[PDB]
Design a protein around this ligand. Structure first.
Ligand SMILES: CC(C)(C#Cc1ccc(-c2ccc(Cl)c3c(NS(C)(=O)=O)nn(CC(F)(F)F)c23)c([C@H](Cc2cc(F)cc(F)c2)NC(=O)Cn2nc(C(F)(F)F)c3c2C(F)(F)[C@@H]2C[C@H]32)n1)S(C)(=O)=O
Ligand SMILES: CC(C)(C#Cc1ccc(-c2ccc(Cl)c3c(NS(C)(=O)=O)nn(CC(F)(F)F)c23)c([C@H](Cc2cc(F)cc(F)c2)NC(=O)Cn2nc(C(F)(F)F)c3c2C(F)(F)[C@@H]2C[C@H]32)n1)S(C)(=O)=O
Ligand SMILES: CC(C)(C#Cc1ccc(-c2ccc(Cl)c3c(NS(C)(=O)=O)nn(CC(F)(F)F)c23)c([C@H](Cc2cc(F)cc(F)c2)NC(=O)Cn2nc(C(F)(F)F)c3c2C(F)(F)[C@@H]2C[C@H]32)n1)S(C)(=O)=O
Ligand SMILES: CC(C)(C#Cc1ccc(-c2ccc(Cl)c3c(NS(C)(=O)=O)nn(CC(F)(F)F)c23)c([C@H](Cc2cc(F)cc(F)c2)NC(=O)Cn2nc(C(F)(F)F)c3c2C(F)(F)[C@@H]2C[C@H]32)n1)S(C)(=O)=O
Ligand SMILES: CC(C)(C#Cc1ccc(-c2ccc(Cl)c3c(NS(C)(=O)=O)nn(CC(F)(F)F)c23)c([C@H](Cc2cc(F)cc(F)c2)NC(=O)Cn2nc(C(F)(F)F)c3c2C(F)(F)[C@@H]2C[C@H]32)n1)S(C)(=O)=O
Ligand SMILES: C=C(C)[C@@H]1CC[C@]2(C(=O)O)CC[C@]3(C)[C@H](CC[C@@H]4[C@@]5(C)CC[C@H](OC(=O)CC(C)(C)C(=O)O)C(C)(C)[C@@H]5CC[C@]43C)[C@@H]12
Ligand SMILES: O=P(O)(O)O[C@H]1[C@H](OP(=O)(O)O)[C@H](OP(=O)(O)O)[C@H](OP(=O)(O)O)[C@@H](OP(=O)(O)O)[C@H]1OP(=O)(O)O
Ligand SMILES: O=P(O)(O)O[C@H]1[C@H](OP(=O)(O)O)[C@H](OP(=O)(O)O)[C@H](OP(=O)(O)O)[C@@H](OP(=O)(O)O)[C@H]1OP(=O)(O)O
Lengths: 232, 232, 232, 232, 232
């Protein structure tokens, strides 16, 4: 037969925009519940594959799906023997998840009498994964990258640029983030030097200027400055 | 038969990441060319539907595809007469674009003898559209929203928030953009008042303070201050 | 039969020069796409084996190819039974990647009716790997090796020479890099000592001169110098 | 038969615009590869013939194509002579490039069973040529035409006007280039005289004024001025 | 039959790494002799085609191979008459070089009774070529580009950038090379001006500042300054 509730182009685009705009806020759960209703496991897998970024969250979702597939296998004992020509094989957990089943098999299960709604079962598994992501997963934010009090400026710059590469933004916005947040979120010891350097300093100049922060000479210099302020 | 070069989960995710990270920089043309080789028009349509945002760009792409389909229809004249039972209908432009053709028909055209590579024809049409986008389309940027010299502060705030809603960023990043760019990119007449308000000013207080800029009272007051400087 | 699109000597040399000149900049993706079109998986493997250096990137590419081969195996079920004498075995994921297939088998698949373009499928897998490399892989640079603020000079020298051995350069250029960058990219505490040492100092004398930096005596001496400057 | 992927008017116009806008930046390689897919060698030659200017680059491309045709002829031995009435002659290197083959022969090769993708082979040869151009060819720029320290002003003017005639620009832009760059890019010895002449000076007047630069009289005069400054 | 000593992926990669790391130092001769032993002329040609850069060296090697092939043809007289059906044609010099012989013919010669080791003969020819390269070929070096005493700065800059384009380095290393060596290896007359310009000067500003060096004005000015020092 045919699946009447196969996802339309606008449904897929709406799901993509939901993920891009809201990330994994709780709002994602109702949206996925409504956009994916009636769809085959193949359509749900398409929707899950359209998620860009958030690799850790997607791995969490995959783990949850695998656990639910194991639970399905536990509850449904394997039947051994020759299947009737009219009948078809009973779904397994991987069949529900669509890893070991074709679209035709999923449609056959969904449109059979009695019907096995593999799409809805898989949808509930995905919802469990999404709930776990919403509770547990925290996406990386370039706004959260601050230099530690004893962190070398080079390591902080490396973390900043890694997070910026993972950041969802336009290249112009990422350039503006580099120009604004990197110096601002440095620790006070490095920030003093960076401000003394001037606004026109390049990254190499900034990195050389802070290369000694925490070394013997810089420690002695700041200690002597504080002691001189005290004596005066 | 079956299509061996149907897009895999990783192929679709790579396309999604390419669009999210590069927007419509020229790099999008090779990637789409390489990620979509040998795919059916249905897979191409899926890839196009996973593009979030850039609605004007997608409208441009659709116009280009429609014009290419019209060109195909002009080149291939429709032949009147019943098709042979072992033969299938010759594709029209809409058939290549995937609008009026099913996946089975596309596979039949691609795997026939002689083959009609509808996927590759549609790929070239999409590449023409993408080239037009890369040449002529410029995405909206929150960094580009600046108050006009005579523009009311309300209108500028409205434009800023519309562009922010359209911006591809996390909610925390969007909040930071609101806290940073809105006052910064205001015109000097509003910006002096906004600075006089102080950092703690809310949006409504900021908008009330600038409500009279350009009115008779504000014009008279600034002229009076300037002539106070002059006749000092 | 024969493969009409086997890579020519100039095609292979062009690929080698692309890798040597641009490393894994995005330009590598279109170039590989155009140089390898119509080639057997054996030719693509020949092209991949000519990449000198970038071992981590090539391991990434191999992981991507293995994932795509697993996806192929998942989508193509194994058929058990006696193959027809006029027929050949259906390609598996390793067969497309060329690990478990011979050049004759690849040519037979590519030139059969219906054809299985194993070269094109493998090319898309390699393109996915190259896209991952372009996005995620960053080659080591001798210019990026700087001494940490608390790093011993000997450890920094070891890191510098390891990176220099990995660097793509002529031996004369590498000697010039040793003569220019090693002292330049040392931290301020070691740089002071190295500059006081003189331009004729050897590597052993430089390591001896900086051997005590961060030790108790050096710390006391720099502290005393700072305090003396403060008292005076 | 007929070629389904024959270049459309928009495809050819896009190729022309790509060449006009980007000259031979790396971007030309993907665009060509995308615009020329599935086309006959005749369409490829039409695409190549629309390149205006860059004659040296076109010559390099022709040399690369001839080299690839020679390689093809080396790999494919010439048949004995008994051509089957139902079969057609096997293509040579010149047939792949379309110099000695007609459109009908190219279509026959492309649509035959087994197929010989003469268009794609030729496209690979053209891509090799374009890669050579991108790597090696540098277009002449009016911005780079500067007078040598001992170059006569007449010779520099002649070089400037030759380059300007070769430059891609409108006549008004060329006139503005003449009014701006010619005096600006002269050597200091001629530039001083040109500045002393005044903005209204014509080309003939400037050329007459600089006719003596480097001669014994001008050298003696400039030396005398320098010595007079020294004595005073 | 089959060639048991066909080059493995690691053999080819080792040869590529040898050429990239050692260029044509004498170490290349043993390495090539060891990696290539027992291989067909086709494998030898692959290894030679994987050499990027050093085009003059490769031309020398090709000339040496052609002369050795001529020597082989002189020593082995061509015999007129039909070859025996069980026998194969006797190799010519081009057959040993692999230009006019297919892989099947090479394998047939190497595995015949008595055997003709065309691979070993070709290897000795290549060794002669590599020896000629090691003795007579010196690769271009960016470190060797120095401005002549009265070379115009523009010509020296052109030479520097051509050599830099030919240089085997990463783009970052080439940028650093431009930042360091170009001013450093200018002649003293231009170098004084370049230092007077300052570190922030662009290439166009440097070319304008040195455009007059060697012209009448600059010669008179420097002579006048020297005479000022003398008559001081
Ligand atoms: C052809 C088509 C119709 C299809 C299909 C199709 C079929 C099956 C599956 C699949 C479903 C369920 C399980 Cl439980 C496993 C499994 N279990 S296992 C042995 O432990 O790994 N494997 N698969 C791969 C299988 F089946 F192919 F083997 C699956 C997918 C998933 C959909 C999915 C994506 C996701 F993110 C998280 C999920 F929970 C499920 N997509 C992938 O898995 C590929 N992926 N994975 C991960 C990650 F690791 F981060 F989670 C990532 C991807 C990514 F999308 F690239 C993206 C960056 C993130 N799609 S179409 C048009 O969409 O291409
Ligand atoms: C079921 C499935 C396999 C399928 C399919 C499927 C089938 C056909 C088409 C389609 C293709 C070509 C043309 Cl030429 C037309 C057409 N020509 S017409 C009379 O002028 O409108 N109509 N269609 C709708 C048709 F065919 F249904 F009639 C099409 C699509 C397109 C793919 C596409 C997306 C795109 F962005 C630009 C394109 F050029 C083509 N997607 C849509 O069209 C929906 N869309 N449109 C637009 C816009 F208008 F902005 F461009 C937008 C969307 C959006 F994705 F929401 C996104 C915000 C942007 N997908 S699946 C798993 O992928 O869901
Ligand atoms: C004879 C010939 C025609 C052939 C062939 C030939 C045949 C197969 C393969 C191969 C292809 C695909 C997979 Cl998926 C695996 C696999 N999968 S596995 C079980 O997990 O390891 N193994 N192979 C080895 C196999 F098949 F032989 F078993 C492969 C290769 C690869 C080509 C390749 C190179 C590459 F860099 C990255 C790739 F993704 C694929 N070359 C190698 O792999 C050897 N290599 N590997 C790595 C690394 F580890 F860094 F990635 C490195 C090399 C290196 F080249 F030395 C270089 C330093 C880097 N070539 S010829 C003229 O070319 O000599
Ligand atoms: C009927 C029709 C459909 C056709 C065809 C048609 C057929 C063949 C060829 C051709 C193709 C390949 C080779 Cl390898 C040779 C060859 N090899 S050879 C013995 O060394 O000269 N000769 N030809 C002439 C041949 F075959 F006709 F004899 C060719 C062309 C080329 C296409 C081409 C253009 C190009 F720029 C660079 C190329 F590599 C290939 N166009 C020309 O060559 C004319 N050209 N050449 C050069 C230059 F020298 F600068 F590169 C220039 C032109 C120019 F366009 F004027 C432009 C200023 C530059 N077109 S159409 C479109 O006319 O209506
Ligand atoms: C298909 C395959 C199995 C094969 C083969 C294959 C077959 C033959 C040959 C060949 C061998 C010997 C001679 Cl004596 C001649 C010849 N004699 S002649 C009439 O005077 O020119 N011609 N050939 C071309 C022939 F045979 F096609 F006619 C050859 C090559 C050579 C191998 C080679 C490379 C080399 F550097 C120096 C050599 F001495 C020999 N590679 C080329 O020639 C292409 N090349 N040439 C030169 C240069 F000119 F600089 F030396 C350059 C290249 C380059 F690689 F691009 C690189 C920049 C340098 N490869 S595979 C997988 O490897 O692609
Ligand atoms: C009589 C005078 C008024 C004064 C009073 C005394 C005097 C003084 O102290 O001023 C002693 C120094 C001299 C003699 C001047 C006169 C001028 C000359 C002269 C400027 C002459 C032109 C010559 O130039 C050339 O030959 C051109 C050149 C490029 C070198 C070439 O052709 O190769 C040079 C060599 C540059 C000299 C330098 C010596 C002095 C200053 C004298
Ligand atoms: O007590 P110490 O044995 O002398 O330890 C010191 C000291 O650590 P203490 O807090 O225990 O005193 C310093 O201070 P902390 O950072 O750990 O708070 C620390 O680092 P800093 O000097 O940068 O502050 C480092 O001192 P050093 O920089 O010399 O490594 C360390 O080791 P030392 O014994 O070598 O001084
Ligand atoms: O000074 P240059 O820029 O190099 O050019 C030359 C050159 O001088 P050099 O010795 O430095 O090369 C000539 O040679 P000399 O006599 O000084 O040895 C000299 O005179 P001659 O040409 O007669 O030999 C004179 O050349 P000119 O007669 O043109 O003045 C001079 O100046 P120019 O740069 O103007 O040629």
């Amino acid at each position: 037969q045919m699946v009447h509730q196969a996802i339309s182009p606008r449904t897929l685009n709406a799901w993509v925009k939901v993920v891009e705009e809201k990330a994994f806020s709780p709002e994602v759960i109702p949206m996925f519940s409504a956009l994916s209703e009636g769809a085959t496991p193949q359509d749900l897998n398409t929707m899950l594959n359209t998620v860009g970024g958030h690799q850790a969250a997607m791995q969490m979702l995959k783990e949850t799906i695998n656990e639910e597939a194991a639970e399905w296998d536990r509850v449904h004992p394997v039947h051994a023997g020759p299947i009737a020509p009219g009948q078809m094989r009973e779904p397994r957990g991987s069949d529900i998840a669509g890893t070991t089943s074709t679209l035709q098999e999923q449609i056959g299960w969904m449109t059979n009498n009695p019907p096995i709604p593999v799409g809805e079962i898989y949808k509930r598994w995905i919802i469990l994964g999404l709930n776990k992501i919403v509770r547990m997963y925290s996406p990386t934010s370039i706004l959260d990258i601050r230099q530690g009090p004893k962190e070398p400026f080079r390591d902080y710059v490396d973390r900043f640029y890694k997070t910026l590469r993972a950041e969802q933004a336009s290249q112009e916005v990422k350039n503006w983030m580099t120009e604004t947040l990197l110096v601002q979120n440095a620790n006070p010891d490095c920030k003093t030097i960076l401000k003394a350097l001037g606004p026109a300093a390049t990254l190499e100049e900034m990195m050389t200027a802070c290369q000694g922060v925490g070394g013997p000479g810089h420690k002695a210099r700041v200690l002597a400055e504080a002691m001189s302020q005290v004596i005066n």
